[PDB]
Design an enzyme around this catalytic site. Structure first.
Site, PDB file in Angstrom:
ATOM      1  CG  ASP A  34      44.011  44.054  37.581  1.00 46.30           C
ATOM      2  OD1 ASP A  34      44.250  45.236  37.212  1.00 46.30           O
ATOM      3  OD2 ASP A  34      43.125  43.798  38.428  1.00 46.30           O
ATOM      4  CG  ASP A  58      41.269  38.887  42.600  1.00 38.40           C
ATOM      5  OD1 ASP A  58      41.806  38.818  43.735  1.00 38.40           O
ATOM      6  OD2 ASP A  58      40.933  39.985  42.096  1.00 38.40           O
ATOM      7  CG  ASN A  59      44.355  41.241  40.011  1.00 34.82           C
ATOM      8  OD1 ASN A  59      43.314  41.105  39.293  1.00 34.82           O
ATOM      9  ND2 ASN A  59      44.555  42.310  40.795  1.00 34.82           N
ATOM     10  N   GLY A 109      30.869  49.323  37.176  1.00 35.78           N
ATOM     11  CA  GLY A 109      31.077  48.543  35.973  1.00 35.78           C
ATOM     12  C   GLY A 109      31.918  49.236  34.914  1.00 35.78           C
TER      13      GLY A 109
END
Ligand SMILES: Nc1ncnc2c1ncn2[C@@H]1O[C@H](COP(=O)(O)OP(=O)(O)NP(=O)(O)O)[C@@H](O)[C@H]1O
Ligand SMILES: [Mg+2]
Ligand SMILES: [Mg+2]
Length: 460
Positions: free
Chosen positions: A253, A243-244, A117
């Site tokens: 990103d 996803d980028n 994280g």
């Protein structure tokens, strides 16, 4: 005195988990973007870790972490999501624009999978420099507002200091958001996302009078234009997973990116990309493949025919933008049909000589049409090309002077080379932020000539 709205939270239920950042230990502000703060109306007193470290919330924020999925290196990866970042809130500006405040490095999330994280100082420095450099080059991008470091160990290949980047962007919608609900078989949620995007970012489209075809057609055009601009300045993203990919066409990103030093079309800066999938010269094709994956998610409620017609328009848009940008970079004020051969012959030569990309174009911006007045093993082949190049310039019948000024306004004197960023990172880890602040300043003026080493090739 700042206005946050809960638009995503209220309008897109079940696309996120509400949760709060996890603060680091002895976090402290090391940099913030003073110019951008003034543009966003952020009082300067807020910077004296507080919200920039996720240790305080401002009135109106309601932090959530978004879910999404993606194809990674061409293979379906399943659920991803905001695994190390949090959308603190969406700020409405006087322009009527909204700006997401996204804290990267915010702690564990339901989407972290086996990740910690956390982000590390070196990647947050690199991302702040890259996104601000892109912005001043005039290319769409997310923006960097602040960096905090900490004493909290974060382990990559070595122990690194934990850090967070406060990222600011009009939206964090990705192609992977649509993919996520499509492959879960929730086509209604897919359409909910499309309607939300059209309502807030394409509001001139009148509701259902062709709205979906025209919107996706613009989505394609914005991704084509984005890629054309990367190619022109020699930027290699390196991780163009779906996803980028930003729905709006923003650079999104910054990880193992690379601005070209030596011109090499097959440049790979991501050393995990073993097949060269994201090499510089594949970005046009990869971005089309990504759009086709996005087009897949819309087939439930958009006619597969209109989707392919929008996909069909991609190569003309990209070629229009790329061609217009190159003509400017070569100083071609008109358009002769010599132009494509002069180009193709230049890139062929530059590749064999491994010429530096940025420097070559900045030096070419000094050309005088009538003069022949050094960096090539085959000087014979250069002066022959330069000769035919300068002859075609005279056809413009415009002055040496205004050609040079046009070129200097599109060929930067400076790009964010990996060794400039490394140097700021090394200084930063030692507690000296001066280099980081100096480099960020220099990147706000990429088209201005310099006397220092910011314009040199890396030392080797
Ligand atoms: N250290 C980490 N801990 C948890 N999740 C991570 C970590 N690094 C990457 N991820 C997640 O793995 C996926 C792929 O990572 P990546 O494309 O590099 O995104 P990111 O740099 O972490 N965030 P972003 O800039 O919002 O796209 C995303 O879902 C990330 O959230
Ligand atoms: Mg990512
Ligand atoms: Mg990343």
């Amino acid at each position: 005195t700042l206005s946050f709205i809960t638009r995503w939270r209220d309008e897109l239920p079940a696309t996120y988990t509400t949760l709060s950042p996890t603060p680091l230990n002895n976090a402290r502000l090391i940099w913030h973007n003073a110019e951008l703060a003034n543009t966003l109306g952020i009082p300067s007193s807020l910077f004296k870790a507080g919200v920039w470290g996720g240790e305080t919330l401002l009135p109106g924020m309601s932090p959530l972490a978004q879910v999404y999925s993606g194809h990674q290196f061409g293979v379906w990866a399943g659920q991803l999501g905001d695994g190390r970042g949090i959308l603190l809130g969406e700020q409405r500006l006087a322009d009527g624009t909204t700006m997401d405040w996204h804290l990267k490095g915010a702690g564990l999330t339901p989407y972290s999978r086996m990740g910690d994280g956390r982000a590390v100082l070196r990647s947050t420095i690199r991302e702040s420099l890259a996104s601000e450099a892109m912005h001043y080059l005039g290319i769409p991008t997310t923006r960097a507002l602040s960096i905090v470091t900490s004493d909290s160990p974060v382990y990559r290949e070595t122990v690194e200091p934990g850090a967070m980047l406060m990222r600011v962007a009009p939206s964090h919608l990705r192609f992977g958001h649509f993919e996520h609900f499509y492959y879960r078989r929730e086509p209604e949620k897919v359409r909910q996302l499309a309607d939300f995007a059209i309502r807030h970012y394409w509001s001139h489209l009148a509701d259902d009078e062709d709205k979906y075809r025209l919107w996706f057609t613009d989505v394609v055009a914005r991704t084509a234009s984005l890629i054309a601009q990367w190619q022109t300045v020699g930027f290699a993203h390196g991780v163009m997973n779906t996803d980028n990919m930003s729905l709006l066409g923003l650079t999104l990103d910054y990880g193992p990116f690379g601005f070209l030093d030596d011109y090499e079309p097959g440049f790979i800066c991501n050393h995990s990309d073993h097949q060269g999938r994201y090499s510089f010269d594949n970005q046009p094709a990869v971005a089309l493949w990504n759009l086709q994956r996005l087009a897949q998610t819309l087939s439930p409620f958009v006619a597969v025919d209109a989707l392919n017609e929008a996909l069909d328009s991609y190569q003309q848009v990209l070629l229009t933008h790329y061609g217009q940008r190159m003509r400017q970079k070569l100083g071609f004020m008109t358009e002769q049909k010599e132009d494509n051969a002069l180009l193709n012959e230049l890139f062929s030569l530059m590749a064999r000589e491994r010429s530096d990309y940025t420097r070559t174009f900045r030096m070419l911006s000094l050309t005088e049409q009538h003069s022949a007045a050094d960096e090539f093993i085959d000087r014979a082949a250069f002066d022959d090309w330069f000769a035919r190049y300068r002859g075609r310039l005279q056809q413009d019948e415009v002055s040496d002077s205004e050609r040079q000024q046009l070129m200097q306004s599109v060929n930067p004197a400076l790009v964010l080379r990996n060794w400039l960023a490394q140097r700021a990172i090394e200084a930063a880890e030692k507690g000296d932020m001066t280099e980081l602040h100096r480099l960020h300043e220099a990147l706000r003026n990429p088209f201005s000539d310099r006397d220092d080493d910011y314009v040199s090739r890396p030392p080797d």
